[model samples]
Target chain A: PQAPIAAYKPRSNEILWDGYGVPHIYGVDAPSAFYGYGWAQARSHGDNILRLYGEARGKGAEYWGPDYEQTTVWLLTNGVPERAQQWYAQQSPDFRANLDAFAAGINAYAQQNPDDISPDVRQVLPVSGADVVAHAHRLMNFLYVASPGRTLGEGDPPD
Target chain B: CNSWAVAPGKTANGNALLLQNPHLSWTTDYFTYYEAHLVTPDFEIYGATQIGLPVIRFAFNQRMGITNTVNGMVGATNYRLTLQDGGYLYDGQVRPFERRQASYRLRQADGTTVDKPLEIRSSVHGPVFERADGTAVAVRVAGLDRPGMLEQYFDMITADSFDDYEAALARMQVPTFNIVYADREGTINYSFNGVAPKRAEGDIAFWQGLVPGDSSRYLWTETHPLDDLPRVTNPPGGFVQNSNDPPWTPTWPVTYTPKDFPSYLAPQTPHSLRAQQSVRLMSENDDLTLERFMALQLSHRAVMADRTLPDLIPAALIDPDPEVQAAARLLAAWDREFTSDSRAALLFEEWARLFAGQNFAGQAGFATPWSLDKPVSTPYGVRDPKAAVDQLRTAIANTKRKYGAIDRPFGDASRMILNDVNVPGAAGYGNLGSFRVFTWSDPDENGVRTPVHGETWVAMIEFSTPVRAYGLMSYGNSRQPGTTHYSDQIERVSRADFRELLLRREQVEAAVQERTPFNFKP
Candidate 1:
């Protein structure tokens, strides 16, 4: 297992990994808990997670290839980024803070572990809270909310 | 998923039994479900969340456990559009189409980007799709206006009682999926929970199918409240099961009627083989222990065999063709089950698939012979006995051609293979009505059939002292390759063995095979 590159004084935040690699994140508050989650997830699944973030941000084609370009168009056509920006603005201060902390944690991990970060993701380092919200919204739109329409023979979203 | 809540009175252990088997594609990027434990002074919950989603989609609190099976409800509809002078026609009026330029950056292998643009159009309904036949279509989905659905699920995690659970459900924010719940209070319930649109009264068939885009009358502007959907709270039958079937047959005696609700709300599907198997298993075992509940979920009997074999046997016996009679006799003598060792299963599965595709496809007014009153009796006999025999002869020839013989063990013919872990397939397709559902890929030229879908996670719980529970995520918990966990749990799924799920902190820590901690700076 890869360890976090930087050493720092411990705080109220801690993530415990049990037998199944399931992280049990504990913190004095929700933001700190989210911070721990961001760091822990980065350490374990950074490569794939960052790729997904890149896809959500409509940088898929720019970072990956023509194969992912359609995904970028899909996100744009569906107004994912615009809706995400609006949703982010309407979020509670506490929720926004948590998202910020989560993003900060991811960035901190990437900054410390430069070798672990890939070149494609390095350009997109310091992923924003808005990026997280955008990814979440896009996933919700695709999986949960959008399936029935497609199943009803509506046109499928761009491949 | 197939879940049941055996009331306390019906359990051998005197505790309510809850069994959940949620089928998902096994190779999802995040292993289908992310097992997590969320705790705070205010609330504590442990269960699986869908990967990439923020909140737990389904899980159990200390006081209660909840799981879901896909429900057959219309979440959205597609309206066919016609091109007029500039836009599409709506209610005898032509409106300009909403046009947008969607641009994408295409990256070349040399690491340069080129701007690629596509023009997209939409009607008031939603995004428009231009079909090959020179027509356009649009879709309108409910609950897309507001997208923070995770908050409702997070609120539900704190529910300590049935009333509180219902209160959380009353939010009606979730788009679709059914709910099967069991609580420590001995309260067990099943609800076809979703935001279903309330449409104008008309032919239910037309509303469910393609609604004419030109008419405003067919459009549904509002959705029904949560309590209005088909639901049962502590039914007299003391059990409920949904294998992606309509809620009307959740339990025996058919409590829900089609006349009571809009057809779109609880659209009827042909009773699935899994649904029949679920009801049959639940009804047969009144005093079930948790072990028996797990056994029922893992049972290999093909419910479709019970529906199809009777007709097949009689039809084949009378056929003039020697090949047809011989195949019929094989099926007649064969046990109509789907065990790894069952030779009959392969023959029946291939025969049924071919028969259903040829004879049943687009046959108007063709309802499943299986119903609440006669659940296992449908497709009892073939109307054209000679034709059925002809199909049987072809099925036999096809099976022999594929496998070098008509008779082979189901396991050898059908295997659940992943990451070099090959095991006898335990699931049958939804069409076969096997409670342990599995959909498989067609055999390669070498005849290697592999299971591709169904039976992703299976869990059984007894609300006994300390709440004993056992569960397995058919795919293990990791996407990274070469990890021990990548294929470990799959072995257990293949063997029908479940690991005891530790609930308390002490239990989790004590059984910890490895521990890694994330520390944040002060």
Candidate 2:
């Protein structure tokens, strides 16, 4: 079981976990905590976890080669390659800082916990904890309101 | 069943008894649906959960006690009725299927993001078809306890099975066919063509195979004018309904007849076996009590498909060795409902999963179960059960099966599979797996099992106390676990204990509160 550690206190933002593990970020107040949250997830998982995003962009397989081959098809179909990065680049500047900090924290964790590395992760390893956190945010956003894989009626937005 | 005790020969009872529970539950992983308590200033409805959303999914109306399930959405309906992708409604004026796509860019709040035409595929039917398809049948579903609205369609086109009709709906620029519904109403209004209009006629079989342009047998086509739908108002007694079953056997078999629609109108498959059992039980008698309705919903026996299994265990359990035949007899003699009793019901439910064709279990565990890759009917008995069982073990070994052991509780099967979010202890069965009707085919994702659907929104009413509606919901209105809505309704639904409330108008303080009968007011 992973231990519960205190997240860095963010002065603002409303954070929500969607049906997919992605957090539906709301409110501008949650900057610091969001950074801490992203950092923590990356440390536990792998850094290249964000490869899913690259995979979505038709680049993950190219960069990582065979290990990520199957994901390229999904990436192409979902338009993750071109569109996702464009939005990420435009996300609030404050959010980007937090993302950067989270990434650094993950790198720090990796440097300190080299012994914890598993064999598979070590062989093709290039990702860091920070990179993983951003990947989670990107993928989760797509699965929920952003993805085009549904056949439901999109009612008018709530008032 | 509408007949009354006062007039045994005729339909009676001003009230309606509708049972529309489809075996479903809540799973966040799959696109099944969600459960929630919908509150919009004046509206307070509670029912199944809808993922990627904030509202009550679908449930029975509090006042009318009517129930509904989302059959399909507007987009899907329009897609199916297209010629190549259009046509059928206005004769030569109708066009054929065309493929296109639509893209939405959220950067521009001006809806300019939706500028690009994504992509669309064409179909055999066109605009006339969409306007004429079965959506008009949805009119029969107005005014009772309702669950699914008319517009929830499931996009299930795989590379193996592709069609163009699905593509046009993506454009979202046309008035196409869509199934919209309410509940407890009797009149049906629909069209035979979307771009044009036509009338409906004859028996259920009349709508069977007649294609367009064939005026002589046109009556057999599914494009029933909205007015010609198989609808009955208040019946002579109450009302009738179905869960994807043909209207012919919807309610009491004797009360309603299918002189018009042919058996092939909808066609029969093992999939409808459960529905056949539903009809058989629903048609038996008119004096249905609420407890009996409960028995029907939870029925676990699969005897209706008796002819489908090959290693057939006759439902004749008694004092005997292995008692397999006794078990079969028990199932045969027992009512074909899913209640908490009946060991046969339990055994068959699990075994049926094993028999379900080419599912996760078969794909992963067995090289080829029964040494066959094709669909078989009455295939169980033709082969040896002992030999089949041994072969089955080899399959289990290949998959390196896990989950502690077999006979894992039903809850374990209802699972939620997200991209990477793994819940440590939560587990479930029915959603997107080998045995379920709708399953996710992706393999290699071990963290699969999480609660999806089970006891979503439950409502049972006794004929004797017709006004009181007993119900339960798996989760409350909110999706967050720690929040008030997460598991609030779990206890109520599992125990079958219920509350009394009016459909839409009755005033209750809490989202889930019991109201006393007005007639018995002190």
Q: Per-residue alpha-carbon lDDT of model 2 for B100-156, expressed as tens digits? A: 453332223232322322343333322111112242110010111111111111111
**Which stretch of 10 consecutive residues in model 1 chain B shows the poorest summed lDDT?**
B358-367
TM-score of chain B of each: 0.93, 0.49
After superposition, the stretches of candidate 1 with alpha carbons farther than 4 Å from their true spots are A1-18, A26-28, A35-48, A92-136, A144-159, B28-31, B202-205, B319-323, B358-368, B372-376, B520-522
Q: Model 1, B1-522: lDDT tens per residue? A: 677777777787777778777777765443356666555445555667655444566677556788887774566776877778987788899999888877777888887878887787777887776545665667676766654455567667657678888888887866678888887678888888877778767544565555678777777788888878888877778787777776777876557777787666765545665676777788777888888887777776666566567766886888777877777777888777777777777777768766666222222212344444575455344555566667778888888888767778778878876688888775677766677877777788767787667777667888775778888777665564345655667767778878888766667668666554544452
lDDT of 1 at A154: 48
Please estimate how well model 1 matches the true structure, expressed as its whole-model Cα lDDT.
0.69
Model 2 chain B is weakest, by summed lDDT over 10 consecutive residues, at B136-145
> Local error of candidate 2 at A142, Å?
19
What is the TM-score (0 to 1) of candidate 1?
A: 0.89
Kindly list the per-residue Cα lDDT of model 1 for residues A28-88, writing each as its tens digit: 6666666766765665556666777787787888788977765676666666777777777
RMSD of model 2 against the true structure: 17.3
